[PDB]
């Protein structure tokens, strides 16, 4: 299963070298399910992602 995404907020920079962006992901499946994910590359607020696995949740706490 492939789920599409939104960007609610761009939080900060994670990763070793400062390559990964920590981003708040709203779902495009109508649900207000806000999962925080890590992205590689440039992401601005209002981007729409293609997540391969939606069950995953990135480094919270």
């Amino acid at each position: 299963p492939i789920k599409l995404a939104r960007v609610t907020k761009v939080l900060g920079r994670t990763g070793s070298q400062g390559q990964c962006t920590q981003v708040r992901v709203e779902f495009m499946d109508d649900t207000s399910r806000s999962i925080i994910r890590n992205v590689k590359g440039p992401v601005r607020e209002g981007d729409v992602l293609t997540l391969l696995e939606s069950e995953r949740e990135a480094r919270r706490l």
């Binding site: 599409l4 994670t14 990763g15 070793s16 070298q17 390559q19 990964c20 962006t21 495009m28 994910r37 890590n38 992205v39 590689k40 590359g41 440039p42 992401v43 601005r44 981007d47 729409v48 992602l49 293609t50 997540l51 391969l52 995953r56 990135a58």
Partner: protein
């Protein structure tokens, strides 16, 4: 009405993916007569999204050492490539290109998280812009690699690459690369 090279339609071009509907720019306002525009797109961040996709392609096709400045060459290659595509499929070449871009770009990537020494990378999600850029890079590289030591022209080879990536077949280099990256990104997690 504006036609690319004075012959190619842009109103027929349909973006399949909702993710890349924002970042592949070719549809209406961004449509231009020629790939060569020579406006600043590296001026500020995210601006290369507002740059035409054909132009982007052109700019990544001259990338290599001996070809490093020659943009007219590149545009001629692109034009001939498009013609070839048209001859082949009958479809609008821009559409084909778009499809290729969609089907070439990686969706997840393994990236180094921790310290220098810890060789266990974590699989992370990929930006849409980056996916476009990367896709373009892959396609151009394929074009290069297919056309190095043979009688085949780059325009021809590039066209072949682009059709192969449009159809989704495993004859394109770009597709292969995507598959190799994607599987790895499914392995690390």
């Amino acid at each position: 009405d504006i036609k690319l090279f004075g012959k190619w339609s842009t109103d027929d071009v349909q973006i399949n993916d909702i993710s890349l509907q924002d970042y592949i720019a070719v549809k209406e306002k961004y449509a231009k007569y020629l790939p060569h525009s020579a406006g600043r797109y590296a001026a500020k961040r995210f601006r290369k999204a507002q740059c035409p996709i054909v132009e982007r392609l052109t700019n990544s096709m001259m990338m290599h050492g001996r070809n490093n400045g020659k943009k007219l060459m590149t545009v001629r290659i692109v034009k001939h490539a498009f013609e070839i595509i048209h001859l082949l499929t009958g479809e609008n070449p821009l559409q084909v290109l778009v499809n290729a871009i969609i089907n070439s770009g990686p969706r997840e990537d393994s990236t180094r998280i921790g310290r220098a020494g810890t060789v266990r990378r974590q699989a992370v999600d990929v930006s849409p812009l980056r996916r476009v850029n990367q896709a373009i890079w892959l396609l151009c590289t394929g074009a290069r690699e297919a056309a190095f030591r043979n009688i085949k022209t780059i325009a021809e080879c590039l066209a072949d690459e682009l059709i192969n990536a449009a159809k989704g077949s495993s004859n394109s280099y770009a597709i292969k690369k995507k598959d190799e990256l994607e599987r790895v990104a499914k392995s690390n997690r």
